[PDB]
Amino acid sequence: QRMWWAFLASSMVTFFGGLFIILLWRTLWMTSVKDWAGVMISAQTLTGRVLVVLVFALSIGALVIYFIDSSNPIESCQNFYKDFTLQIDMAFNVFFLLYFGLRFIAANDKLWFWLEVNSVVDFFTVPPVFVSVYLNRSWLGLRFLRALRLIQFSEILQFLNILKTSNSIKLVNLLSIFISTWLTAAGFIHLVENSGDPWENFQNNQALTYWECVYLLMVTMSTVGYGDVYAKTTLGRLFMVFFILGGLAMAASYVPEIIELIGNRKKYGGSYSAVSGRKHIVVCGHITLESVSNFLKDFLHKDRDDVNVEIVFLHNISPNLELEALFKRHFTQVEFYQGSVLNPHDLARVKIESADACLILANKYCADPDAEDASNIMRVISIKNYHPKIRIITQMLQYHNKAHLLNIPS
Amino acid sequence: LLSIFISTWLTAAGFIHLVENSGDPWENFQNNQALTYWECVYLLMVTMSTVGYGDVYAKTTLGRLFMVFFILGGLAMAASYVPEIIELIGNRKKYGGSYSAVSGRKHIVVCGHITLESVSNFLKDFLHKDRDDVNVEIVFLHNISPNLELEALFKRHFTQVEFYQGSVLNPHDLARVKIESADACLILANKYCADPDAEDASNIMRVISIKNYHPKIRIITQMLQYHNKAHLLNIPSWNWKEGDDAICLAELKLGFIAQSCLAQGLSTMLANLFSMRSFIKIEEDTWQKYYLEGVSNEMYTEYLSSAFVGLSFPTVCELCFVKLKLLMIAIEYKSANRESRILINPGNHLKIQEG
Amino acid sequence: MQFDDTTGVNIPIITELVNDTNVQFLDQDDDDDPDTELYLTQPFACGTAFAVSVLDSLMSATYFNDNILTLIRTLVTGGATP
Ligand SMILES: CC(C)CCC[C@@H](C)[C@H]1CC[C@H]2[C@@H]3CC=C4C[C@@H](O)CC[C@]4(C)[C@H]3CC[C@]12C
Ligand SMILES: CC(C)CCC[C@@H](C)[C@H]1CC[C@H]2[C@@H]3CC=C4C[C@@H](O)CC[C@]4(C)[C@H]3CC[C@]12C
Ligand SMILES: [K+]
Ligand SMILES: [K+]
Ligand SMILES: [K+]
Ligand SMILES: [K+]
């Protein structure tokens, strides 16, 4: 009195016999309606957008219906007119069938359209409910596969103008994929465990709820494995072995994308934060180990009277290990930021408009002293263009170049 | 590797099954555990993933010793085969593959010296917010992989801009970006190079390659030196009348400067006249509002109506300014003796012809 | 170029090329396609392009028969005796 084979074989034949028919045909006014169906379901059309939003919402509803019905016996008789929840489910299913037909009549190629995820979930969803309403006896089958539509969720978030950047869209896509595969693996485990082994007259059934199977999958994939719940049936244990192996492979395949979305942390980004009752000096120019070491040795002398002045270094070249150690030794008085004086955004970052002074150090060991002097004069011009009233102390290599400083009215 | 993994899994399961079902010999085989072979396969898989449910486990002393050895040896074996797994996985090519065409949407191939500044300026003018809706995508083709700044800039325009690693001189890469269906190819030059002539020759060779692949595609190229663009006339597929253009940077820049020497501010006027500028409403009495009133103007070309034929240029210009509120600057004069020539503000002796 | 007593298209030239893929840039009347091999292009078949890479094949030809190089040298260099 268990005719689940009919429900399974319905999906099997609707997936295989029609594919074989298409293959046989290939081995051997419709254009207008095909183009109309293609433009009707196109993503550029507003009708296509509202229709895919509607089908996403109805797939969510079907998933909730499966969640409600999972607490019931898997294969049981029911009446068409005695409950309207099954009527809602079959209305959803016939809407899915109509949308599948619209996609099928608008498909440029039949074989590739017949071998995609939406087609196979429709094949495993709609013929079972047709057989159920024909025989007036339902079977909880592969209805969890509707969760596989959650992958399209990010696309909906792109149609609603909620997601704009590419990184957020890809993050939502990966999260949706992970959640959907988790839910569908839990559904397979729940079905195989609660049904029992067929060759042993279904005497191996284990009364596990769907959420206990979700919990089991989460405990397994973290490699924690409490053993409070586990699969007891032979086919369930085979499914768990396959799930462990496939999940290991899938996690290994998605490591580079996780690394890419994590990215690299900028060590010396961000902006200086002012402290009330405390001045700061911006230091720029040729920032290396020796010049900074000498300047800090005299400026932060132990015999110097208590002065509440912080030092903010601004330099585009990232410091090496020795400069990093030197900055760490004075971590309570010295901060470093990566940036250029010639960029006004970086000047706003170090709060040059409230700094007490700007000190510009020169490269004493350079091939062309005149080029170094001109670069420093241009730094002075940039700083004074941003804030004309700030005090500037600069280093000049050659004597004839400092006359250029008199050409700056600030 | 797959065969090695499967074989060692099966033989470890066989050892565990034998030792567990036989029992300990020194205790008269009273420690036997009735485990099937497939339960031992399942046990080995659960162990080597470090999940360890504990629903099934080895109970005998020799079985537990075998399991300890299996854990240690499997750890060592997995550690030894990591480099081979990495090698077979390899490195994913970030910018491989081919451009996929979309029906009812044109695309432009951009090549040459592709860096941050040139791409930024071109995209700032091309993808302007005030630009009328144009369904044109941009496909960059360049052998040098982009850096972090170019990657961020391409990500900001991920819905309109795609990048591909490849060379213009390679016909496979030209087939990848679908140069045979592109609306145009735009070649940018390296303005900061040691030898401008070498850069110009390289760009001319890129033009030769593109025209050899597809002779009918429209090409807009940048030329550094003026004497080099004559080489473009040696290409029989190069058609100036069909839209092929060379923009000479030196000639145009120094001509702008010379005309501003004759009348200062002319370079600013011309640059604002062909650039897209967003209009800003100013109500304060400053010079910015008077400036921005005239910034919004642009150049257009139109065929004169048949009612203007036989009339002098000053008459039609005054009619356009007073009635139509349009400033007509120049006309295109055609003749049988010579080619078409652009006439800037011709005198009253000239008369408007047909078309 | 154009000449008066008429065009440079009939002037016989030979061009040395380093890359074989650049041979099809030398001719415009060719009906060749991008996938055409070097020896089937018009510039190669007409002798107006010399690809240096052919010498790389000569080494292999020398391995299977050492007299080929001697014949080529005595036919090509003009008769240079030892
Ligand atoms: C990719 C998927 C759709 C194809 C794999 C086939 C799956 C769906 C099939 C193959 C074997 C099937 C199982 C075989 C036997 C039974 C016992 C019975 O009480 C119904 C459910 C259950 C437990 C079946 C569920 C569906 C099942 C797991
Ligand atoms: C390289 C491999 C072949 C060498 C490993 C040694 C093998 C041959 C030996 C070492 C100890 C042996 C076990 C010792 C005791 C018993 C109990 C008895 O009921 C027979 C099987 C069993 C369980 C033996 C199986 C074979 C065994 C595992
Ligand atoms: K454990
Ligand atoms: K345990
Ligand atoms: K455990
Ligand atoms: K303008």
From Swiss-Prot, chain A:
Highest taxon of the lineage: Eukaryota
Ranges facing Extracellular side: 71-85, 132-135, 193-206, 230-238
Signal peptide interval: none
A GO term for molecular function: metal ion binding
Main location: membrane
Note: The protein was initially thought to contain two functionally distinct parts: The core channel (from the N-terminus to the S9 segment) that mediates the channel activity, and the cytoplasmic tail (from the S9 segment to the C-terminus) that mediates the calcium sensing. The situation is however more complex, since the core channel also contains binding sites for Ca(2+) and Mg(2+).
Disease linkage: Paroxysmal non-kinesigenic dyskinesia 3 with or without generalized epilepsy: An autosomal dominant neurologic disorder characterized by absence seizures, generalized tonic-clonic seizures, paroxysmal nonkinesigenic dyskinesia and involuntary dystonic or choreiform movements. Onset is usually in childhood. Patients may have seizures only, dyskinesia only, or both. Epilepsy, idiopathic generalized 16: An autosomal dominant form of idiopathic generalized epilepsy, a disorder characterized by recurring generalized seizures in the absence of detectable brain lesions and/or metabolic abnormalities. Generalized seizures arise diffusely and simultaneously from both hemispheres of the brain. Seizure types include juvenile myoclonic seizures, absence seizures, and generalized tonic-clonic seizures. EIG16 is characterized by onset of seizures soon after birth or in the first years of life.
This protein's name: Calcium-activated potassium channel subunit alpha-1
Organism: Homo sapiens (Human)
Upper classification of the organism: Eukaryota, Metazoa, Chordata, Craniata, Vertebrata
Entire protein: shown range: 84 to 539 of 1236
UniProtKB/Swiss-Prot annotation, chain C:
Superkingdom of origin organism: Eukaryota
Subcellular location: Cell membrane
Motif stretch (Calcium bowl): 15-37
Binding site for Ca(2+): Q24, D27, D30, D32
Ranges for region Segment S10: 44-64
Post-translational modifications reported in the UniProt record: Phosphorylated. Phosphorylation by kinases such as PKA and/or PKG. In smooth muscles, phosphorylation affects its activity. Palmitoylation by ZDHHC22 and ZDHHC23 within the intracellular linker between the S0 and S1 transmembrane domains regulates localization to the plasma membrane. Depalmitoylated by LYPLA1 and LYPLAL1, leading to retard exit from the trans-Golgi network.
Tissue specificity note: Widely expressed. Except in myocytes, it is almost ubiquitously expressed.
Quaternary structure (record): Homotetramer; which constitutes the calcium-activated potassium channel. Interacts with RAB11B. Interacts with beta subunits KCNMB1, KCNMB2, KCNMB3 and KCNMB4. Interacts with gamma subunits LRRC26, LRRC38, LRRC52 and LRRC55. Beta and gamma subunits are accessory, and modulate its activity.
General function of this protein: Potassium channel activated by both membrane depolarization or increase in cytosolic Ca(2+) that mediates export of K(+). It is also activated by the concentration of cytosolic Mg(2+). Its activation dampens the excitatory events that elevate the cytosolic Ca(2+) concentration and/or depolarize the cell membrane. It therefore contributes to repolarization of the membrane potential.
Other comment: The protein was initially thought to contain two functionally distinct parts: The core channel (from the N-terminus to the S9 segment) that mediates the channel activity, and the cytoplasmic tail (from the S9 segment to the C-terminus) that mediates the calcium sensing. The situation is however more complex, since the core channel also contains binding sites for Ca(2+) and Mg(2+).
UniProt free text on domains: The S0 segment is essential for the modulation by the accessory beta subunits KCNMB1, KCNMB2, KCNMB3 and KCNMB4. The S4 segment, which is characterized by a series of positively charged amino acids at every third position, is part of the voltage-sensor.
Family indicated by similarity: Belongs to the potassium channel family. Calcium-activated (TC 1.A.1.3) subfamily. KCa1.1/KCNMA1 sub-subfamily.
Protein name according to UniProt: Calcium-activated potassium channel subunit alpha-1
Organism: Homo sapiens (Human)
Gene name as annotated: KCNMA1
